[PDB]
Amino acid sequence: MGPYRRLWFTLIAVLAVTFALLGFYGGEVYRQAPPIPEEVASADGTRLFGRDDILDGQTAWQSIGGMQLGSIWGHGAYQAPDWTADWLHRELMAWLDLAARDAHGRDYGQLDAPAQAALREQLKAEYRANRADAAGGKLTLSPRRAQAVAQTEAYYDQLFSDAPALHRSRENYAMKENTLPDANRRRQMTHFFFWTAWAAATEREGTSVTYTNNWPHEPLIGNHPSSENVMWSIISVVVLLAGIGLLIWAWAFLRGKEEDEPPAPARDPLTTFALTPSQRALGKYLFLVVALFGFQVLLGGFTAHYTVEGQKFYGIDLSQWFPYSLVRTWHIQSALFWIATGFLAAGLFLAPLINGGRDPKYQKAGVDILFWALVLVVVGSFAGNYLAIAQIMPPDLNFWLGHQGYEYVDLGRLWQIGKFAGICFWLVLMLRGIVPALRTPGGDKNLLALLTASVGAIGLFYGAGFFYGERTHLTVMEYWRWWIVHLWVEGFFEVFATTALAFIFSTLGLVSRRMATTASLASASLFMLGGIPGTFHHLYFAGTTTPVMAVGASFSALEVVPLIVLGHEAWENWRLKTRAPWMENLKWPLMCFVAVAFWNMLGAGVFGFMINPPVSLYYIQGLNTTPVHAHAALFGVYGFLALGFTLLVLRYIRPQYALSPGLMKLAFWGLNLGLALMIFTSLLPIGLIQFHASVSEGMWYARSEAFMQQDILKTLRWGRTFGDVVFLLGALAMVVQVILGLLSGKPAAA
Amino acid sequence: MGPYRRLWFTLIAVLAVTFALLGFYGGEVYRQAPPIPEEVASADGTRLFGRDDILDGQTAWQSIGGMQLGSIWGHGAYQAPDWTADWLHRELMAWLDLAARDAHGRDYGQLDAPAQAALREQLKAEYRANRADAAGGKLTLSPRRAQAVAQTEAYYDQLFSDAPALHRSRENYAMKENTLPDANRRRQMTHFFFWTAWAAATEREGTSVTYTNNWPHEPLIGNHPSSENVMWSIISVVVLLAGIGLLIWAWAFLRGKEEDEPPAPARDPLTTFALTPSQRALGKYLFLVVALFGFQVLLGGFTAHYTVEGQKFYGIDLSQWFPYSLVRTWHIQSALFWIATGFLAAGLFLAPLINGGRDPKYQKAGVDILFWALVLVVVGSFAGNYLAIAQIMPPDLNFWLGHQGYEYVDLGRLWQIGKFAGICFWLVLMLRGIVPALRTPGGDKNLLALLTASVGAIGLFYGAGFFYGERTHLTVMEYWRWWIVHLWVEGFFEVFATTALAFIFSTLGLVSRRMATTASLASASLFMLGGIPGTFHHLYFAGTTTPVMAVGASFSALEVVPLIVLGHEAWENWRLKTRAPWMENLKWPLMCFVAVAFWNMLGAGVFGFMINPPVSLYYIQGLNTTPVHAHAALFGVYGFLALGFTLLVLRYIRPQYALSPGLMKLAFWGLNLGLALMIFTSLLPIGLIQFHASVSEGMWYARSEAFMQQDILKTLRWGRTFGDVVFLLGALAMVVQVILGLLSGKPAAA
Ligand code: HEM
Ligand code: HEM
Ligand code: HEM
Ligand code: HEM
Ligand SMILES: CCCCCCCCCCS[C@@H]1O[C@H](CO)[C@@H](O[C@H]2O[C@H](CO)[C@@H](O)[C@H](O)[C@H]2O)[C@H](O)[C@H]1O
Ligand SMILES: CCCCCCCCCCS[C@@H]1O[C@H](CO)[C@@H](O[C@H]2O[C@H](CO)[C@@H](O)[C@H](O)[C@H]2O)[C@H](O)[C@H]1O
Ligand SMILES: COC1=C(OC)C(=O)C(CC=C(C)C)=C(C)C1=O
Ligand SMILES: COC1=C(OC)C(=O)C(CC=C(C)C)=C(C)C1=O
Ligand SMILES: [Ca+2]
Ligand SMILES: [Ca+2]
Ligand SMILES: [Fe+3]
Ligand SMILES: [Fe+3]
């Protein structure tokens, strides 16, 4: 250790305290998870279904793409409805039509507002009070509810079949015809849908708050944000602004003038080390990064196609094979794979450069095995998803081989274990290069310690996804899944990137190593403080209680703090272009890392915070504001990191290859301005129109085909094409650029 | 001009565009102001009251302290209810009791939720649809409403009298017994109360939105934030975070390295110029600053006393003479006077130092006349308010001599003209010192131009308060009043301060003058951009339409941007302590200006933004979050500025007088930590408990005696005493310190 004990003990302290909050409120997530009533029975006494049928329905839902086909509890895809909200609304409306007929022999819609208000009050009384027995033993539905449920089951049985009545709906929902062709599976699935709506609509014992924290916004049962949601929402903003103001104050006042900026080396240091065999073995990883990235981008276009034409594509019904659910899955899964691969490549490039520019024994071996391991996992998983969504996949294999139905962990459990083994194997290849450099009785090993930590965090924190299986409770799946998607990606990828950059720039002699170790420990602490408990900003409405929402709100506020100030970091890293004339070769990677800062600030920070205070998210969860954020944050940050890192590794593994300034201006500006156009001209306007709808009418309405198929939204969804094309141009330029680079040095190992 | 053309044209552009938005949406504020129906009649045809009675009631309300005694449309004092919300709730509940009796011969409270829901639906139908005729000609009340109104009039007739039934309420409301002793005036006043509740509860023609933008939160008539409110609220946060992120990005990338830091002079430059006669004439202004400040602080304690014991003070009923309404008025009015005087003194100290350390002819004259002019205005206004609140003041003199009843412009119109004439006269004394320095055919006159602009902005933008008279529509009063309180204080005082500091530090040779002119033009643009349209964040619910709320929300978001980054500015100004050994003499003033930055960030920025997005404010307007902000922002920023400036002028006009490091550590830390304790241990917890109540039940409930008199709130109101005392200690230390200073070397503290 040495001059960074404080920054270390602060990181450890942040980790300790944060994983306390995450792990403790993890016990409260498990405990307060909406019961799955062993038995759902009508009051008349007839057994409707039970746990096993709700869970069987979870698996059927999984098998069809789960969260890749609309949403549950506001998690998943956005073209189909939130099934919970849609179900809730359809069941409550069915109930109200039965209520209204019983009491007035007119339908609810036919009644005067006062009759309607009284019905709504009886609906609310019934639905909100409809807890299962103690031990979540038996849920009795009133016969009206049992009936509402029966006729809501009927509706979804038709929607998820080939039933021509609901063809327009499937088109509008980018559902393939016969999404879920087994009638039993569809029935079971409706049980699952029921259960989520039920949870959504049932107050927790001795609360005014549903198991989903009154999610979704369903005025009919007085699902409105809790007052606590509203509390923590205001607190989050204060936490955020306090946090920024104090961070800037701390930084302004606790820098200490800063010193030690030696002249940059004469020669790029990283060009002094000869490419190890395992470093030249990364061309194919760079290929895979751009291949998957280009694939991914096309899959977004394919996905985006279905949001404007749910089924045909020049009159061939592509949805039979490549439905929205599949291409959305692939779109997301491919994003992860190519981003991960960028990072994995970045790391593997560094590993042998960390043990003094020499390969650990069998590092080229491992770098080639790891590569095919990843391609296997990608092809297998993708095939698995195809087969899951095609409904070829035996239901009882679906979760292993098919589609977990959980967004970002969609790949079958087998492939997920493959991916984990891959990433663990990469942990070994990294540590093969980093352990010697740690065990060498030498100088400042603190950046490298932070890196090996980062590397082990990547290495192992993807195994958080094995704490849920197929029939695990959504709330528990949700808990663990957001370890992966939020903690492992948005946290441990960040720190590994930031640490690997700090390490590269320090190694390049652009930054002292003190300045790097210090910068990257302080960053670690900054990101992890908000990051780690910020996992909960995904679990507000996932069957979780208000504490989870408090932690999530407040700590997600803290997570924005370091993002919003990234203007300064960005400039610090961009400054490095001028430190040495050879930094012109790292121009583009450096432009990426500035785009990372930019999008971290805007995408992750601004658009993450837009949707983060429970009260905002309460309404906008599962609206187009998420994909705004998701695009801006995942691509803008980790995509540009991965590409930046791609271009960096390319700079070194094709050291004579000069990037085309034109191609890279197109690649870089196409991506940046494509991404801004997608967000600002399509996704964000839509998310806001939907936010309006969600707030005005309810979540069901914001997600509803009638609403989603209105002309403004059709035009805004069509207008996405501009940004999508500007972006595909950029992505194409980037893909070509890297391909040309790779083809400029042995075209037959890529 | 010269190297600052861009920064100038940007300031002019910001001013142009901003005063466009303010002046344009000012036409929309006038046009969309809730009608005052010429006639209010029962449907049965009986004339209840009219315009003249509502306006007469406005004057009666004014006469009793207006906004210094609870709130109208969430503007005013917080110990009494919001009368609009309280009235609305009492009338709607009365209506519901009449409804419930008509239909069920039980009271609303006695009915089942469904009956209650149906009644609420009929209430909502009636109240929301209850527009006046076209031309705001006649408002017909349903006889039930006419009755609800009659029995709500009765309640307030009793509350505002000596009626022993409502004694506990008056105590809880810090209302004096016989607050409004004329029965007619009270009746008229209830008409006014009615009208505000009516506006609050009536949808605008062809909207779902009341004249007050559904304010207050009154679930009974589906007064909930508009979807637009909710829209602009999310946009504001995005505008804010985008704004910070981009500002930091712009700053990070568009600084240009920065150069020209000459060695600080050897001798304090300002000690080289001999004190002009008009500068020594400022001791008494410094006295008045601390006298009013100490008075003000005691008045806060007196005010705070009434929030825990509405009437007695060791068993003598002080409320007969010095009721909460009076001492709150004085508390606020004194704040303005001593803060203004700080600035006016600061300016007058600079005036002769700007025309080369020599007094314009008759500057000592003017500085003495201006002083007694201010003391006259302070004593007269204060006497006026006493007499208004005592109800001695003839009602028809009340608005001229008494109490305008509008917060921060409470002083009678005469005194307000006095204050304006004073500030205009100060404009002349400033320009007496600044015009020569501008007309001298010389070098860089751009800071001094920005200063003379700032000075003219102070000089004239207080005359915005003469665009409303006594019987002016609240919405129009509100429009103009917030020019004064928000624009003139929170905008033109800021820029004058910042410019006068830039000017002082530049004159001291601590900053280039380029760096000053540049810093202070960029600041001007930054503050004015958000500041000026941010006036509207006061008018969201004041009878204004959604555009006003959009502008207000978005531009108030922009106004936070420069505040949150002030950590950096603060450090830049604090840096100056080290530039010259003689800056030890300006240590404390510099500590003030850092406290200004701190509180600008936290008080104005964090706590201003806490309460700023229409959706937050919708619920928290008139809750203890405002006084948190108001204390932290007005004292923390302008109070410390004024005191900073006080200590600075003291440093020079008592140039041999050394400040007591102990006294000033107590003064400074007592104020800072007193202010933090007041906010964090009392006001903020309360505001949040009330926010909870406001969101859960409605504004009426959050402001209601039952709620406000709960034990937690009693304890939190009592616990204020800690911070109040720590603060009074600080203030006392500061007052003594300045007194001792003034009493040193020829004692001149008039
Ligand atoms: C032309 C480029 C792109 C297009 C047209 C596109 C389109 C889409 C579409 C249509 C969706 C689904 C919205 C829905 O659920 O109905 C989506 C989701 C997503 N896209 Fe993209 N995409 C593009 C690029 C990218 C890139 C480059 C990344 C990351 C590398 C990415 C990551 C994602 C993610 C993570 C989701 C899931 C978002 C969420 O659930 O909020 N996309 N995209
Ligand atoms: C680079 C950093 C980040 C990345 C890569 C990232 C990525 C994502 C992605 C892909 C999603 C969509 C997840 C889903 O479909 O269910 C998401 C959702 C979300 N993110 Fe981020 N994020 C980042 C930072 C942040 C920050 C800083 C915040 C808030 C402070 C935040 C808050 C959220 C919230 C609240 C959601 C949920 C939206 C919803 O449930 O519909 N994220 N994030
Ligand atoms: C010991 C010090 C202080 C105490 C105990 C105190 C107390 C109070 C109280 C009790 C209120 C009225 C809350 C209500 O409406 O019921 C109030 C309002 C106010 N105080 Fe103070 N005060 C203090 C210091 C100051 C100082 C130093 C300033 C400015 C120089 C100031 C400015 C104000 C303002 C502007 C209001 C009106 C606030 C609003 O309506 O939101 N106070 N104060
Ligand atoms: C130093 C700068 C500022 C000062 C001196 C200041 C002062 C005040 C004062 C004294 C109040 C209470 C007014 C009243 O009683 O009706 C107030 C209210 C308010 N301020 Fe500020 N303020 C400042 C900056 C800001 C900022 C930066 C924001 C938001 C971006 C803001 C937003 C508000 C809002 C929304 C209210 C209304 C609260 C309510 O109506 O109950 N202010 N300000
Ligand atoms: C500052 C951060 C900004 C983001 C966080 C703000 C989140 C917004 C809070 C939403 S309040 C929401 O508004 C709703 C309507 O606008 C209101 O709900 C009601 O209103 C309907 C009128 O259309 C009414 O018919 C329904 O009974 C009901 O849905 C209510 O304000 C709440 O749901
Ligand atoms: C960033 C800061 C955000 C500030 C804006 C705050 C957001 C306001 C949205 C709250 S919606 C509002 O909440 C109220 C309760 O919290 C709701 O109350 C209602 O339903 C509740 C039972 O479900 C209960 O309180 C009452 O029975 C009933 O009046 C209210 O209708 C709802 O719109
Ligand atoms: C409007 O929906 C869309 C398509 O189908 C109609 C596309 O094919 C395309 C074409 C471009 C790509 C990225 C495949 C885009 C952009 C798209 O979003
Ligand atoms: C001592 O008791 C109290 C008062 O009178 C009842 C106050 O004046 C005040 C104000 C504080 C001072 C300086 C006594 C508060 C808050 C209080 O609790
Ligand atoms: Ca999703
Ligand atoms: Ca007030
Ligand atoms: Fe997240
Ligand atoms: Fe304001």
Coordinates of N, CA and C in Angstrom, one line a residue, chain B residues 175-297:
Chain B
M175 N -52.4 32.9 15.7 CA -53.3 34.0 15.4 C -53.5 34.8 16.6
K176 N -53.5 36.1 16.6 CA -53.9 36.8 17.8 C -55.4 36.7 18.0
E177 N -55.9 36.8 19.2 CA -57.3 36.9 19.5 C -57.8 38.2 18.8
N178 N -58.9 38.1 18.0 CA -59.5 39.2 17.3 C -58.5 39.7 16.3
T179 N -58.0 38.7 15.5 CA -57.0 39.0 14.4 C -57.7 40.1 13.5
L180 N -58.9 40.0 13.3 CA -59.7 40.8 12.3 C -61.0 41.2 13.0
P181 N -61.0 42.2 13.9 CA -62.1 42.5 14.8 C -63.4 43.0 14.1
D182 N -63.3 43.7 13.0 CA -64.6 44.1 12.3 C -65.2 42.9 11.7
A183 N -66.5 42.6 12.0 CA -67.3 41.5 11.5 C -67.4 41.6 10.0
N184 N -67.6 42.8 9.5 CA -67.8 43.0 8.0 C -66.5 42.6 7.3
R185 N -65.4 43.1 7.8 CA -64.1 42.9 7.2 C -63.8 41.4 7.2
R186 N -64.2 40.7 8.3 CA -64.1 39.2 8.4 C -65.0 38.6 7.3
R187 N -66.2 39.0 7.2 CA -67.1 38.5 6.2 C -66.4 38.7 4.9
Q188 N -66.1 39.9 4.5 CA -65.5 40.2 3.2 C -64.3 39.3 3.0
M189 N -63.5 39.1 4.1 CA -62.3 38.3 4.0 C -62.6 36.9 3.7
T190 N -63.7 36.4 4.2 CA -64.2 35.0 3.9 C -64.5 34.9 2.4
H191 N -65.1 36.0 1.9 CA -65.4 36.1 0.4 C -64.1 35.9 -0.4
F192 N -63.1 36.6 0.1 CA -61.7 36.5 -0.5 C -61.3 35.1 -0.3
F193 N -61.3 34.5 0.9 CA -60.9 33.1 1.1 C -61.6 32.2 0.1
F194 N -62.9 32.5 0.0 CA -63.8 31.7 -0.9 C -63.2 31.7 -2.3
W195 N -63.1 32.9 -2.8 CA -62.6 33.2 -4.1 C -61.3 32.4 -4.4
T196 N -60.4 32.4 -3.4 CA -59.1 31.7 -3.7 C -59.3 30.2 -3.8
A197 N -60.2 29.6 -2.9 CA -60.5 28.2 -2.8 C -61.3 27.9 -4.1
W198 N -62.2 28.8 -4.5 CA -63.0 28.7 -5.7 C -62.0 28.5 -6.9
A199 N -61.2 29.5 -7.1 CA -60.1 29.5 -8.1 C -59.4 28.2 -8.0
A200 N -59.0 27.8 -6.8 CA -58.2 26.6 -6.5 C -58.9 25.4 -7.1
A201 N -60.2 25.4 -7.1 CA -61.0 24.2 -7.2 C -61.8 24.2 -8.6
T202 N -61.8 25.3 -9.3 CA -62.5 25.4 -10.6 C -61.6 25.1 -11.7
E203 N -61.9 24.1 -12.6 CA -61.1 23.9 -13.8 C -61.2 25.1 -14.7
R204 N -60.1 25.4 -15.4 CA -60.1 26.4 -16.4 C -61.0 25.9 -17.6
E205 N -61.7 26.8 -18.2 CA -62.6 26.5 -19.4 C -61.7 25.6 -20.3
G206 N -62.2 24.4 -20.7 CA -61.6 23.5 -21.7 C -60.2 23.1 -21.2
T207 N -60.1 22.8 -19.9 CA -58.9 22.1 -19.3 C -59.5 21.2 -18.2
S208 N -58.6 20.3 -17.7 CA -58.9 19.4 -16.6 C -58.2 20.0 -15.3
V209 N -57.8 21.3 -15.4 CA -56.8 21.9 -14.5 C -57.4 23.1 -13.9
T210 N -57.3 23.2 -12.6 CA -57.9 24.4 -11.9 C -57.1 25.7 -12.3
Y211 N -57.6 26.8 -12.0 CA -57.0 28.1 -12.2 C -55.6 28.2 -11.4
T212 N -55.5 27.4 -10.4 CA -54.3 27.3 -9.6 C -53.5 26.0 -10.0
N213 N -53.8 25.5 -11.1 CA -53.1 24.3 -11.6 C -53.3 23.2 -10.5
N214 N -54.5 23.0 -10.1 CA -55.0 21.9 -9.3 C -54.4 22.1 -7.9
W215 N -54.0 23.2 -7.6 CA -53.4 23.5 -6.3 C -54.6 24.0 -5.4
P216 N -54.7 23.6 -4.2 CA -53.8 22.7 -3.5 C -54.2 21.2 -3.7
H217 N -53.3 20.4 -3.3 CA -53.5 18.9 -3.3 C -54.7 18.7 -2.4
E218 N -55.8 18.3 -3.1 CA -57.1 18.1 -2.4 C -57.8 17.0 -3.1
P219 N -57.4 15.8 -2.7 CA -57.9 14.5 -3.3 C -59.4 14.6 -3.5
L220 N -60.2 15.2 -2.6 CA -61.7 15.3 -2.6 C -62.2 15.9 -3.9
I221 N -61.4 16.7 -4.6 CA -61.9 17.3 -5.9 C -60.9 16.8 -7.0
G222 N -60.1 15.8 -6.7 CA -59.1 15.4 -7.7 C -58.2 16.4 -8.1
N223 N -57.9 17.4 -7.2 CA -56.7 18.3 -7.3 C -55.5 17.4 -7.0
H224 N -54.9 17.0 -8.0 CA -53.6 16.3 -8.1 C -52.8 17.1 -9.1
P225 N -51.5 17.0 -9.0 CA -50.6 17.7 -10.0 C -51.2 17.3 -11.4
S226 N -51.4 18.3 -12.3 CA -51.6 18.0 -13.7 C -50.5 17.0 -14.2
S227 N -50.8 16.4 -15.4 CA -49.8 15.5 -16.0 C -48.7 16.4 -16.5
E228 N -49.0 17.6 -17.1 CA -48.1 18.7 -17.5 C -47.1 19.1 -16.3
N229 N -47.7 19.4 -15.2 CA -46.9 19.7 -14.0 C -45.8 18.5 -13.9
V230 N -46.3 17.3 -13.9 CA -45.5 16.0 -13.8 C -44.4 16.0 -15.0
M231 N -44.9 16.3 -16.2 CA -44.0 16.4 -17.4 C -42.8 17.3 -17.0
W232 N -43.1 18.6 -16.7 CA -42.2 19.7 -16.6 C -41.2 19.5 -15.5
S233 N -41.7 18.8 -14.5 CA -41.0 18.4 -13.3 C -39.9 17.4 -13.7
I234 N -40.2 16.4 -14.5 CA -39.2 15.4 -15.0 C -38.2 16.2 -15.9
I235 N -38.7 17.0 -16.8 CA -37.9 17.8 -17.7 C -37.0 18.7 -16.8
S236 N -37.5 19.4 -15.8 CA -36.7 20.3 -15.0 C -35.5 19.5 -14.5
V237 N -35.6 18.3 -14.0 CA -34.5 17.5 -13.4 C -33.5 17.2 -14.5
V238 N -34.0 16.9 -15.6 CA -33.1 16.6 -16.8 C -32.4 17.9 -17.2
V239 N -33.2 19.0 -17.3 CA -32.6 20.3 -17.6 C -31.5 20.5 -16.6
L240 N -31.8 20.3 -15.3 CA -30.9 20.6 -14.2 C -29.6 19.8 -14.4
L241 N -29.7 18.5 -14.6 CA -28.5 17.6 -14.6 C -27.8 17.7 -15.9
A242 N -28.5 17.8 -17.0 CA -28.0 18.1 -18.3 C -27.1 19.4 -18.1
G243 N -27.8 20.4 -17.6 CA -27.2 21.8 -17.4 C -25.9 21.7 -16.6
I244 N -25.9 21.0 -15.5 CA -24.7 20.8 -14.7 C -23.6 20.1 -15.5
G245 N -24.0 19.0 -16.1 CA -23.1 18.1 -16.8 C -22.4 18.8 -18.0
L246 N -23.2 19.5 -18.8 CA -22.8 20.3 -19.9 C -22.0 21.5 -19.4
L247 N -22.5 22.2 -18.4 CA -21.7 23.4 -17.8 C -20.3 22.9 -17.4
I248 N -20.2 21.8 -16.7 CA -18.9 21.2 -16.3 C -18.1 20.8 -17.5
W249 N -18.8 20.2 -18.5 CA -18.2 19.9 -19.8 C -17.6 21.1 -20.5
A250 N -18.4 22.2 -20.6 CA -18.1 23.4 -21.3 C -16.9 24.0 -20.5
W251 N -17.0 24.1 -19.2 CA -15.9 24.7 -18.4 C -14.7 23.9 -18.5
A252 N -14.8 22.5 -18.4 CA -13.6 21.6 -18.5 C -12.9 21.9 -19.8
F253 N -13.6 22.1 -20.9 CA -13.1 22.1 -22.3 C -12.9 23.5 -22.9
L254 N -13.5 24.5 -22.3 CA -13.5 25.9 -22.9 C -13.0 26.9 -21.9
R255 N -12.1 26.5 -21.0 CA -11.3 27.4 -20.1 C -10.2 28.1 -20.9
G256 N -9.3 27.3 -21.5 CA -8.2 27.8 -22.4 C -6.9 28.0 -21.5
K257 N -6.7 27.1 -20.5 CA -5.5 27.0 -19.7 C -5.4 28.1 -18.6
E258 N -5.7 29.4 -19.0 CA -5.8 30.6 -18.1 C -4.4 31.1 -17.8
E259 N -4.2 32.4 -17.8 CA -2.9 33.1 -17.6 C -3.1 34.5 -17.1
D260 N -2.0 35.2 -16.8 CA -2.1 36.5 -16.1 C -2.6 36.4 -14.7
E261 N -1.7 35.9 -13.8 CA -1.8 36.0 -12.3 C -0.6 36.8 -11.8
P262 N -0.6 38.2 -11.9 CA 0.5 39.0 -11.4 C 0.7 38.8 -9.9
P263 N 1.8 39.1 -9.3 CA 2.0 39.0 -7.9 C 1.0 40.0 -7.3
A264 N 0.3 39.7 -6.2 CA -0.6 40.6 -5.5 C 0.2 41.8 -5.1
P265 N -0.4 43.0 -5.1 CA 0.2 44.2 -4.5 C 0.9 43.9 -3.2
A266 N 1.7 44.8 -2.7 CA 2.5 44.7 -1.4 C 1.6 45.2 -0.3
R267 N 0.9 46.3 -0.6 CA -0.1 47.0 0.3 C -1.5 46.7 -0.4
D268 N -2.4 46.3 0.4 CA -3.9 46.4 0.1 C -4.1 47.7 -0.7
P269 N -4.5 47.6 -2.0 CA -4.8 48.8 -2.8 C -5.8 49.7 -2.1
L270 N -6.9 49.2 -1.6 CA -8.0 49.9 -1.0 C -7.6 50.6 0.2
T271 N -6.5 50.3 0.9 CA -5.9 51.0 2.0 C -5.0 52.2 1.5
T272 N -4.8 52.3 0.2 CA -3.9 53.4 -0.4 C -4.8 54.6 -0.6
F273 N -6.0 54.4 -1.1 CA -7.0 55.5 -1.1 C -7.4 55.8 0.3
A274 N -7.4 57.1 0.7 CA -7.9 57.6 2.0 C -9.4 57.4 2.0
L275 N -10.0 57.1 3.1 CA -11.4 57.1 3.3 C -12.0 58.4 2.9
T276 N -12.9 58.5 1.9 CA -13.6 59.7 1.5 C -14.6 60.0 2.7
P277 N -15.1 61.2 2.8 CA -16.1 61.5 3.8 C -17.3 60.6 3.7
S278 N -17.8 60.2 2.5 CA -19.0 59.4 2.3 C -18.7 57.9 2.6
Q279 N -17.4 57.5 2.7 CA -17.0 56.2 3.1 C -17.0 56.0 4.6
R280 N -16.5 57.0 5.4 CA -16.6 57.0 6.8 C -18.1 57.2 7.3
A281 N -18.9 57.8 6.5 CA -20.4 58.0 6.6 C -21.1 56.6 6.5
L282 N -20.3 55.5 6.3 CA -20.9 54.1 6.2 C -20.9 53.3 7.5
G283 N -20.1 53.8 8.5 CA -20.1 53.1 9.8 C -21.6 52.9 10.3
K284 N -22.4 54.0 10.2 CA -23.8 53.9 10.6 C -24.6 53.0 9.8
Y285 N -24.2 52.9 8.5 CA -24.9 51.8 7.6 C -24.5 50.5 8.1
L286 N -23.2 50.3 8.5 CA -22.7 49.0 9.0 C -23.5 48.7 10.3
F287 N -23.7 49.7 11.1 CA -24.4 49.6 12.4 C -25.8 49.1 12.1
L288 N -26.5 49.9 11.3 CA -27.8 49.6 10.8 C -27.9 48.1 10.3
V289 N -26.9 47.7 9.5 CA -26.9 46.3 9.0 C -26.9 45.4 10.1
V290 N -26.1 45.5 11.1 CA -26.0 44.6 12.3 C -27.1 44.8 13.2
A291 N -27.6 46.0 13.4 CA -28.7 46.3 14.3 C -30.0 45.6 13.7
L292 N -30.2 45.9 12.4 CA -31.4 45.2 11.8 C -31.2 43.7 11.8
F293 N -30.0 43.2 11.5 CA -29.7 41.8 11.5 C -30.0 41.2 12.9
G294 N -29.5 41.9 14.0 CA -29.7 41.3 15.3 C -31.2 41.4 15.6
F295 N -31.8 42.5 15.2 CA -33.3 42.7 15.4 C -34.0 41.5 14.8
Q296 N -33.6 41.3 13.5 CA -34.2 40.4 12.6 C -34.1 39.0 13.2
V297 N -32.9 38.7 13.8 CA -32.7 37.3 14.4 C -33.6 37.2 15.6

